[PDB]
Design a protein around this ligand. Structure first.
Ligand SMILES: [Zn+2]
Lengths: 198, 7
């Protein structure tokens, strides 16, 4: 009992900057700082933007603010707290069945708005800051116009699928792969987030 | 066969 350890907090380590004409990844914290911040849960950095890059001790992935909640995947974050200026913040939503977790959006973040367009031409924002067209194929599936190796999509779970008007259509969670080639993606539709919130 | 790979 005396030597039992605790899991650290999820730590924001950067963002996918979508503020201008060019999408690009920015790092805001390096490895040592990330490790320290994960243990204290105290992160005094100013947060900006809609899509954060987040890390645990073992994975780096994405998290997206939609309607004042910072959302990511359960398979990345588990039940972990997130580091914040006031210390660790407990999850507000946890749903292993949807592969979905959420925390109150950090002050300074900007939130996307859920899509009401009912459109099927979508765009996936990756951890490498590419914006890839995705044709919607079902409630939770879309096809990549150009296939990619799965290596390329690893670390992008928690990132958004957007409509042409820039609304949030879903949260990316898993590649649909054959022999290492992703031709499609599985995502959590924004309507499922909306149900969770209401 | 296609499989889901969590990312
Ligand atoms: Zn829309």
């Amino acid at each position: 009992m005396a030597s039992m350890k605790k899991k650290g907090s999820v730590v924001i380590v950067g963002r996918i900057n979508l503020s201008g004409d060019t999408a690009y990844a920015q790092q805001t914290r390096g490895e040592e700082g990330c490790q320290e911040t994960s243990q204290t849960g105290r992160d005094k950095n100013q947060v900006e933007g809609e899509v954060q890059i987040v890390s645990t001790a073992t994975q780096t992935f994405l998290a997206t603010s939609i309607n004042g909640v910072l959302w990511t995947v359960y398979h990345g974050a588990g039940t972990r707290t997130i580091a914040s200026p006031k210390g660790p913040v407990t999850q507000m939503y946890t749903n292993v069945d949807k592969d979905l977790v959420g925390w109150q959006a950090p002050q300074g973040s900007r939130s996307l708005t859920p899509c009401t367009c009912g459109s099927s031409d979508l765009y996936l924002v990756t951890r490498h800051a590419d914006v890839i067209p995705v044709r919607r194929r079902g409630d939770s599936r879309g096809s990549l116009l150009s296939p990619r190796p799965i290596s390329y999509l690893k670390g992008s779970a928690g990132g958004p699928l957007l409509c042409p008007a820039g609304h949030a259509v879903g949260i990316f969670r898993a590649a649909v792969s054959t022999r290492g080639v992703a031709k499609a993606v599985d995502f959590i539709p924004v309507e499922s987030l909306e149900t969770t919130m209401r | 066969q296609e499989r889901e790979v969590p990312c």
